[PDB]
Amino acid sequence: LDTFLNSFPTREFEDDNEYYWDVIGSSRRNIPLVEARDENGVVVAANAAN
């Protein structure tokens, strides 16, 4: 157990408070659809035309 915990390096810290690190996601995404309407305003259902 001493050899396993000696295989990791050591970072000093300035204070005795909590410490963070920022994790990042990407800027590219896709957006789900909610509804869809035609020109006159009625919602496009599943059994509708083109």
């Binding site: 000696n6 295989s7 990791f8 390096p9 970072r11 000093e12």
Partner: protein, 43 residues
């Protein structure tokens, strides 16, 4: 970690030297210097 420096010269191989450099760019405290943010506010 930073590897063993007490080796013969033949065991100071290419991968031994590369693990000293790889330790350095994993990422400071000095007993006679200020912190880096203390100096940069002075500049």
């Amino acid at each position: 970690n930073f590897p063993r420096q007490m080796l013969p010269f033949s065991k100071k191989t290419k991968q031994w030297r590369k693990d000293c450099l790889l330790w350095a760019n994993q990422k400071n405290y000095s007993l006679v210097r200020k912190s880096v943010i203390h100096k940069k506010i002075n500049y």
